[PDB]
Amino acid sequence: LLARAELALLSIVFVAVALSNGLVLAALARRGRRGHWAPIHVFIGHLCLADLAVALFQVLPQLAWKATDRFRGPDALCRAVKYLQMVGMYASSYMILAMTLDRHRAICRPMGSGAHWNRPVLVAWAFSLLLSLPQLFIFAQRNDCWACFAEPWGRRTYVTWIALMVFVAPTLGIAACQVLIFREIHAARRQLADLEDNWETLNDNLKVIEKADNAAQVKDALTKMRAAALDAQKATPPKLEDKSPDSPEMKDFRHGFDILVGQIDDALKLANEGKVKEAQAAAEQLKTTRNAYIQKYLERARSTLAAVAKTVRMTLVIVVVYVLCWAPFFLVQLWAAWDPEAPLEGAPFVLLMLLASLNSCTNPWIYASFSSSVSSELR
Amino acid sequence: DIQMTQSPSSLSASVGDRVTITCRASQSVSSAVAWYQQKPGKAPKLLIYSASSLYSGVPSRFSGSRSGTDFTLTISSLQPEDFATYYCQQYLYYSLVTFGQGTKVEIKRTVAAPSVFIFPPSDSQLKSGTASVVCLLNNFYPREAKVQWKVDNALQSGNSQESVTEQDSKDSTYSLSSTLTLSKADYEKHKVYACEVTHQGLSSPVTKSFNR
Amino acid sequence: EVQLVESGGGLVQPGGSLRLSCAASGFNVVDFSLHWVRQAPGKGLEWVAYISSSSGSTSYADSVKGRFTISADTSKNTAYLQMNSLRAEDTAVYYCARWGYWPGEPWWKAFDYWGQGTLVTVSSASTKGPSVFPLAPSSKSTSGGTAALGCLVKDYFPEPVTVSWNSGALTSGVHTFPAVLQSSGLYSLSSVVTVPSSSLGTQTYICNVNHKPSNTKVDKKVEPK
Ligand SMILES: Cc1ccccc1C(=O)Nc1ccc(C(=O)N2CCC[C@H](O)c3cc(Cl)ccc32)c(C)c1
């Protein structure tokens, strides 16, 4: 009685997924009622919904008198159940694609939408519903309730197409979006590195001016500071933040650096005239101005990049877990379908089924561990 | 002091040929590099007023680019008017201005094998107490026309002065003339004179001779 | 509209004094810093000095520090450069450039309006007329092609000098090489012409050299050999 294992496993995993998803959704609602709703939250919630659907349609029915058997109902119920399973699979595949596309948009081309839906998620759900229509034609109450397809290779065109549209194409698109996103993030990183280096050289040269005792060294340090300031001022913000012409920058960043360079020029004039002490006093005033103006902007810029990187890493983790969990299932199904050597079977499909459900029950934990507010809410 | 060095001392190009001029700065000047064009007997003309920003009144023909400390001026299509000297300036501060060496752009042409002529000193020079034997190499495009004098079949250096005329636009060629000034006493003490040219256009070095 | 004109250049002797001036029209000298940039004959540009009338700040190059003095006058809107203790290396063409102040674009447009430049020569020599020496052609230029002819002019201090052939009639293959300063302090050049070898006497050529600084005009005629 191997079912002792099989059914039992289904039970527990079902519980897991259900519980976890429920909890996460609850947290979201709280964060949507306390005034901290977020643009990404919608996506996450919808993904959770997809997971729930999978469970309610795939491991619960399969957690029946071994689903495919008698005592189900009329052909209509069987066809509807299979359609629900296929739409659940498509939604699980495509919600991650929608999340990755949203990340790409927010990282590359920053731009209505409701509080529980938006354009990309609705598009993914609609595509999932409309692409699973064939499941109604193929499946019926054939008699158990199985599906008979066209004898001329009904499999190499159905199962292969399912694998191509659910796993191959969405995963390839997600990989392309991920590599583009990481290129963009690495770009926004060397620019902040250049700004940090300019700040470091400015500080070091200011210290040198303080320690100096002759006009030559003071003037050389001032020249280094001036070049560094000019280079830094020409550092447009990355695409991950506000538009470059705006009050925060045009009024305080560029103007701050203009006043900086003016003070540097005045110190240089004093040094050229030959009054080193006046140059040192001007350098101290320069320190005061730079600390007042640019430190907060640099600190703020160092934080938004961190949040963007954290969310991108969360999305990458979700994608990696999803592929690791669903690849064996599609691989085995395609192997059986396309290959003529399909006959061999030791009934490993139960393990692939459980592994596929692992991703659905794991996604909420992935999200919780990557969001401080949500993790605190789960408390 | 910030020092700017231009690698191309002189570039030869033909009409329609894209050309590039490179400059390197000792320190890091924050895109504070300008590119000027000077033509003979004229003041410079600001072409590029930053690392890359083009100046008003300048065709889009010219462009500039920066890479950390490298700076480059690129001309896409070379016109007859383009031929002129080009200077790279670093203007990080009022008192730290420093120009480059200068890159001269001139028309291109094939070799021409210049004809070498020799003019002995006139008797009037001998009457006045001086001698000036001259050698003339005309109608050769490429430069590097090394010329060596020989007095009594003996190399003579340090007293020959050479002047090369500007590359004319009617034929795009050069004409060099070298004079070997000598005192009258130093002139009569020798018998023969000669000049030798090792220009690229000639298959082998040529030599012209004169007997006193 | 915008224009800078220099004046005061000329010929002097080492250790003397000179007073270059630059007048600007179309803008205010107060709103722009005025730089003096010199270029030696045949060499690259070399920044010399600069003044900024708004604050009175002035600066000079190390090679000329302590000798030149740069001042400005806003009422007349003119910059001046007093040069003292001159030397041979100070000979050059001095241009005056305009450079805007720091805030904004006026600073990034470096030397956007130069002047025609004024020539300054330092030399102990004095004005002297140019001699003439014909360069008679070969004994018999029978080689297939054209023969060569010309003349030498030497021992004239002021550079400018005019050379003409047949009162300007001859202009085919005329080459007048740039003047080169000799060790004696006087200039010297040569003019040459390529002429048909078929006949020389039937088409006798002459060289006329005129020198305005010394008002010296002389004509010479070549002969065959
Ligand atoms: C029950 C469960 C729990 C957790 C994860 C996955 C499942 C699960 O069995 N899905 C499932 C399996 C088989 C079917 C199903 O009829 N065709 C019909 C063609 C034959 C071939 O078989 C197949 C391969 C592929 Cl790639 C996609 C669908 C299907 C459907 C519509 C859904």
Coordinates of N, CA and C in Angstrom, one line a residue, chain B residues 1 30-34 36 38 41-46 49-51 55 87 89-102 117-122 124-125 128 130-134 136-139 161-166 168 170 173-177 179 181, chain C residues 33 35 37 39 43-47 50 52 57 59-60 62 65 95 98-102 105 107-117 132-138 141 146-150 152 154 173 175-183 188 190 192-194 220 225:
Chain B
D1 N 52.7 70.8 -12.1 CA 52.0 71.4 -13.3 C 51.4 70.3 -14.2
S30 N 38.7 67.4 -14.9 CA 37.3 66.9 -15.1 C 36.7 67.4 -16.3
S31 N 36.9 66.8 -17.4 CA 36.4 67.1 -18.7 C 36.7 68.6 -19.1
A32 N 37.7 69.2 -18.4 CA 38.0 70.6 -18.7 C 39.1 70.6 -19.8
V33 N 38.8 70.1 -21.0 CA 39.7 70.1 -22.1 C 38.9 70.7 -23.3
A34 N 39.6 71.6 -24.0 CA 39.1 72.2 -25.2 C 40.0 71.9 -26.4
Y36 N 41.1 73.4 -30.2 CA 41.2 74.6 -31.0 C 41.8 74.2 -32.4
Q38 N 43.9 76.1 -35.5 CA 44.7 77.3 -36.0 C 45.1 77.0 -37.4
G41 N 49.0 81.9 -40.1 CA 48.7 83.4 -40.1 C 47.3 83.7 -39.6
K42 N 46.8 83.0 -38.6 CA 45.5 83.3 -38.0 C 45.5 82.8 -36.6
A43 N 44.6 83.5 -35.8 CA 44.5 83.1 -34.4 C 43.7 81.8 -34.3
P44 N 43.9 81.1 -33.2 CA 43.2 79.8 -33.0 C 41.7 80.1 -33.1
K45 N 40.9 79.0 -33.2 CA 39.5 79.0 -33.2 C 38.9 77.9 -32.4
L46 N 38.1 78.3 -31.4 CA 37.6 77.3 -30.4 C 36.6 76.3 -31.2
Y49 N 34.5 73.1 -26.8 CA 34.6 73.9 -25.6 C 34.4 73.0 -24.3
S50 N 34.4 71.7 -24.4 CA 34.5 70.8 -23.3 C 35.1 69.5 -23.8
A51 N 35.1 68.5 -23.0 CA 35.6 67.2 -23.4 C 35.0 66.8 -24.7
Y55 N 31.0 73.5 -30.1 CA 30.9 75.0 -30.0 C 29.9 75.5 -31.1
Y87 N 45.1 72.1 -31.6 CA 45.7 72.2 -30.2 C 44.7 71.8 -29.2
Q89 N 43.8 72.1 -25.2 CA 44.1 72.9 -24.0 C 43.4 72.3 -22.8
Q90 N 44.1 72.3 -21.6 CA 43.5 71.9 -20.4 C 43.3 73.2 -19.5
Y91 N 42.1 73.5 -19.1 CA 41.8 74.7 -18.5 C 41.1 74.5 -17.2
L92 N 41.7 73.7 -16.3 CA 41.1 73.4 -15.0 C 41.0 74.6 -14.1
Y93 N 41.9 75.6 -14.3 CA 41.9 76.8 -13.5 C 42.6 77.9 -14.3
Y94 N 42.3 79.2 -13.9 CA 42.8 80.3 -14.6 C 44.3 80.3 -14.7
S95 N 45.0 79.9 -13.6 CA 46.5 79.9 -13.6 C 47.1 78.6 -14.0
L96 N 46.3 77.6 -14.4 CA 46.8 76.3 -14.7 C 46.6 75.9 -16.2
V97 N 46.5 76.9 -17.0 CA 46.2 76.7 -18.4 C 47.5 76.1 -19.1
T98 N 47.3 75.1 -19.9 CA 48.5 74.4 -20.5 C 48.0 73.8 -21.8
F99 N 48.6 74.2 -22.9 CA 48.3 73.7 -24.3 C 49.1 72.5 -24.6
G100 N 48.7 71.8 -25.7 CA 49.4 70.7 -26.2 C 50.5 71.0 -27.2
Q101 N 51.1 70.0 -27.8 CA 52.2 70.2 -28.7 C 51.6 70.7 -30.1
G102 N 50.6 70.1 -30.6 CA 50.0 70.5 -31.8 C 50.1 69.4 -32.9
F117 N 68.6 70.0 -57.5 CA 69.4 70.9 -58.2 C 70.4 71.5 -57.2
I118 N 71.6 72.0 -57.8 CA 72.6 72.6 -57.0 C 73.0 73.9 -57.6
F119 N 73.1 74.9 -56.8 CA 73.5 76.2 -57.2 C 74.8 76.6 -56.6
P120 N 75.9 76.7 -57.3 CA 77.2 77.2 -56.7 C 77.2 78.6 -56.3
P121 N 78.0 79.0 -55.4 CA 78.0 80.4 -55.0 C 78.3 81.3 -56.1
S122 N 77.7 82.5 -56.2 CA 77.9 83.5 -57.2 C 79.2 84.2 -57.0
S124 N 79.8 87.2 -57.1 CA 79.6 88.4 -56.2 C 79.8 88.1 -54.8
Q125 N 79.4 86.9 -54.3 CA 79.6 86.5 -52.9 C 81.1 86.4 -52.6
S128 N 82.5 89.8 -52.2 CA 82.1 90.4 -50.9 C 82.7 89.6 -49.7
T130 N 82.3 85.8 -49.0 CA 81.4 84.8 -48.4 C 81.0 83.8 -49.5
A131 N 80.5 82.7 -49.1 CA 80.1 81.6 -50.1 C 78.8 81.0 -49.6
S132 N 77.9 80.6 -50.5 CA 76.7 80.0 -50.1 C 76.3 79.0 -51.3
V133 N 76.6 77.8 -51.1 CA 76.2 76.7 -52.1 C 74.8 76.2 -51.6
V134 N 73.9 76.2 -52.6 CA 72.5 75.9 -52.3 C 72.1 74.6 -53.0
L136 N 68.4 72.3 -53.9 CA 67.0 72.5 -54.0 C 66.3 71.1 -54.3
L137 N 65.3 70.8 -53.6 CA 64.5 69.6 -53.8 C 63.1 70.0 -53.9
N138 N 62.5 69.9 -55.1 CA 61.2 70.4 -55.3 C 60.2 69.3 -55.8
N139 N 58.9 69.5 -55.5 CA 57.9 68.6 -56.0 C 58.0 67.2 -55.5
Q161 N 71.8 75.2 -43.3 CA 70.4 75.7 -42.9 C 69.4 75.3 -44.0
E162 N 68.4 74.6 -43.6 CA 67.4 74.1 -44.5 C 66.0 74.8 -44.2
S163 N 65.3 75.2 -45.2 CA 64.0 75.7 -45.1 C 63.1 75.0 -46.1
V164 N 61.9 74.6 -45.6 CA 60.9 73.9 -46.5 C 59.7 74.8 -46.6
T165 N 59.3 75.0 -47.9 CA 58.1 75.8 -48.1 C 56.8 75.1 -47.8
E166 N 55.8 75.8 -47.5 CA 54.5 75.2 -47.2 C 54.0 74.4 -48.3
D168 N 51.9 73.5 -51.0 CA 51.0 74.3 -51.9 C 49.7 73.5 -52.2
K170 N 47.9 73.8 -55.0 CA 47.7 73.6 -56.4 C 48.2 72.2 -56.8
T173 N 52.5 69.5 -52.7 CA 53.9 69.0 -52.7 C 54.7 70.0 -51.9
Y174 N 55.9 69.6 -51.6 CA 56.9 70.5 -50.8 C 58.1 70.8 -51.7
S175 N 58.8 71.9 -51.2 CA 60.0 72.3 -51.9 C 61.0 72.8 -50.8
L176 N 62.0 72.0 -50.6 CA 63.0 72.3 -49.6 C 64.3 72.9 -50.2
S177 N 64.9 73.8 -49.5 CA 66.2 74.4 -50.0 C 67.1 74.5 -48.8
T179 N 71.0 75.6 -47.6 CA 72.2 76.5 -48.0 C 73.3 76.1 -47.0
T181 N 76.4 77.8 -45.8 CA 77.2 79.0 -45.7 C 78.6 78.6 -45.3
Chain C
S33 N 37.6 87.5 -17.7 CA 39.0 87.6 -17.4 C 39.7 87.6 -18.7
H35 N 43.3 87.0 -20.7 CA 44.5 86.2 -20.7 C 45.4 86.6 -21.9
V37 N 48.3 85.0 -24.2 CA 48.9 83.8 -24.6 C 49.8 84.1 -25.8
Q39 N 52.8 82.7 -28.7 CA 53.2 81.6 -29.6 C 54.5 82.0 -30.2
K43 N 56.2 77.4 -33.3 CA 56.0 76.5 -32.1 C 54.6 76.6 -31.6
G44 N 54.3 75.8 -30.6 CA 52.9 75.7 -30.1 C 52.6 76.9 -29.2
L45 N 51.3 76.9 -28.8 CA 50.8 78.0 -27.9 C 51.4 77.8 -26.5
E46 N 51.5 78.9 -25.8 CA 52.0 78.9 -24.4 C 51.4 80.0 -23.7
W47 N 50.6 79.6 -22.7 CA 49.9 80.6 -21.8 C 51.0 81.5 -21.1
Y50 N 47.5 86.4 -17.0 CA 46.1 86.6 -17.0 C 45.7 87.6 -15.9
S52 N 42.1 89.6 -14.0 CA 40.6 89.5 -13.7 C 40.3 90.8 -13.0
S57 N 42.7 90.2 -9.2 CA 43.6 89.1 -9.2 C 44.4 89.0 -10.5
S59 N 47.8 86.8 -12.5 CA 48.8 85.6 -12.4 C 49.7 85.6 -13.7
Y60 N 50.8 85.0 -13.5 CA 51.8 85.0 -14.6 C 52.4 83.6 -14.6
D62 N 55.6 80.9 -14.9 CA 56.9 80.8 -14.2 C 58.0 81.4 -15.1
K65 N 57.6 85.1 -14.8 CA 57.2 85.7 -13.5 C 58.3 86.7 -13.0
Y95 N 48.6 86.8 -28.5 CA 47.1 86.9 -28.6 C 46.5 87.2 -27.2
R98 N 39.7 85.8 -24.1 CA 38.6 86.2 -23.1 C 38.1 84.9 -22.5
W99 N 38.0 84.8 -21.2 CA 37.5 83.7 -20.5 C 36.5 84.0 -19.4
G100 N 35.3 83.4 -19.5 CA 34.3 83.8 -18.6 C 34.5 83.3 -17.1
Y101 N 33.7 83.9 -16.2 CA 33.8 83.5 -14.8 C 33.2 82.2 -14.5
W102 N 33.5 81.7 -13.3 CA 33.2 80.3 -13.0 C 31.7 80.0 -13.1
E105 N 28.1 78.4 -17.8 CA 28.7 78.1 -19.1 C 29.8 79.0 -19.4
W107 N 32.3 79.8 -18.0 CA 33.6 79.2 -17.6 C 34.0 78.0 -18.5
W108 N 33.0 77.2 -18.9 CA 33.3 76.1 -19.7 C 33.7 76.5 -21.2
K109 N 33.3 77.7 -21.6 CA 33.7 78.2 -22.9 C 35.1 78.9 -22.7
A110 N 36.2 78.1 -22.8 CA 37.5 78.6 -22.6 C 38.0 79.3 -23.8
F111 N 38.5 80.5 -23.6 CA 39.1 81.3 -24.7 C 38.3 81.2 -26.0
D112 N 37.0 81.7 -25.9 CA 36.1 81.6 -27.0 C 36.2 82.8 -28.0
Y113 N 37.0 83.8 -27.7 CA 37.2 84.9 -28.5 C 38.6 85.5 -28.4
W114 N 39.5 85.1 -29.3 CA 40.9 85.5 -29.3 C 41.0 86.8 -30.1
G115 N 42.2 87.3 -30.2 CA 42.5 88.5 -31.1 C 43.5 88.1 -32.2
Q116 N 43.7 89.0 -33.1 CA 44.5 88.7 -34.3 C 46.0 88.5 -33.9
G117 N 46.4 88.9 -32.7 CA 47.7 88.7 -32.2 C 48.7 89.8 -32.7
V132 N 71.5 90.8 -52.7 CA 71.0 90.0 -53.8 C 72.1 89.2 -54.4
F133 N 71.9 87.9 -54.6 CA 72.9 87.1 -55.3 C 72.2 86.1 -56.3
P134 N 72.4 86.3 -57.6 CA 71.8 85.4 -58.5 C 72.4 84.0 -58.4
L135 N 71.6 83.0 -58.7 CA 72.0 81.6 -58.7 C 72.0 81.1 -60.1
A136 N 73.1 81.3 -60.9 CA 73.1 81.0 -62.3 C 72.8 79.5 -62.5
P137 N 72.1 79.1 -63.5 CA 71.7 77.7 -63.7 C 72.9 76.8 -64.0
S138 N 72.7 75.5 -64.3 CA 73.8 74.7 -64.6 C 74.5 75.2 -65.9
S141 N 71.7 72.9 -69.0 CA 70.7 72.0 -68.5 C 70.0 71.3 -69.6
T146 N 62.7 70.8 -67.3 CA 62.9 72.2 -67.1 C 64.1 72.5 -66.2
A147 N 64.7 73.6 -66.4 CA 65.8 74.1 -65.6 C 65.4 74.9 -64.4
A148 N 66.3 75.2 -63.5 CA 66.0 76.0 -62.3 C 66.9 77.3 -62.3
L149 N 66.3 78.3 -61.7 CA 66.9 79.6 -61.6 C 66.5 80.2 -60.2
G150 N 67.2 81.2 -59.8 CA 66.7 81.9 -58.6 C 67.7 82.9 -58.1
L152 N 69.3 84.7 -54.1 CA 69.4 84.7 -52.6 C 69.4 86.2 -52.1
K154 N 69.9 88.2 -48.4 CA 70.5 88.0 -47.1 C 70.7 89.3 -46.4
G173 N 55.5 77.9 -61.1 CA 56.6 77.2 -60.4 C 57.5 78.2 -59.6
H175 N 58.8 79.5 -56.1 CA 58.9 79.1 -54.7 C 59.8 80.1 -53.9
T176 N 59.2 80.7 -52.9 CA 60.0 81.6 -52.1 C 59.9 81.0 -50.7
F177 N 61.0 80.4 -50.2 CA 61.0 79.6 -49.0 C 61.0 80.6 -47.8
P178 N 60.4 80.1 -46.7 CA 60.4 81.0 -45.5 C 61.7 81.5 -45.1
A179 N 61.8 82.7 -44.6 CA 63.0 83.3 -44.1 C 63.5 82.5 -42.8
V180 N 64.8 82.3 -42.7 CA 65.4 81.6 -41.6 C 66.4 82.5 -41.0
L181 N 66.3 82.7 -39.6 CA 67.3 83.5 -38.9 C 68.6 82.8 -38.9
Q182 N 69.7 83.6 -39.1 CA 71.0 83.1 -39.1 C 71.7 83.4 -37.7
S183 N 72.9 82.8 -37.5 CA 73.6 83.0 -36.3 C 74.0 84.5 -36.1
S188 N 67.6 85.6 -43.9 CA 68.0 85.2 -45.3 C 67.1 84.2 -45.9
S190 N 65.8 82.4 -50.0 CA 66.1 82.2 -51.5 C 64.8 82.1 -52.2
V192 N 63.2 80.8 -56.0 CA 63.5 79.9 -57.1 C 62.4 79.8 -58.1
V193 N 62.7 79.4 -59.3 CA 61.7 79.3 -60.4 C 62.2 78.2 -61.3
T194 N 61.2 77.4 -61.8 CA 61.5 76.4 -62.8 C 61.0 76.9 -64.1
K220 N 67.8 92.5 -60.3 CA 69.0 91.8 -60.8 C 68.5 90.9 -62.0
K225 N 75.1 79.8 -68.2 CA 76.4 79.3 -67.9 C 76.9 78.3 -68.9

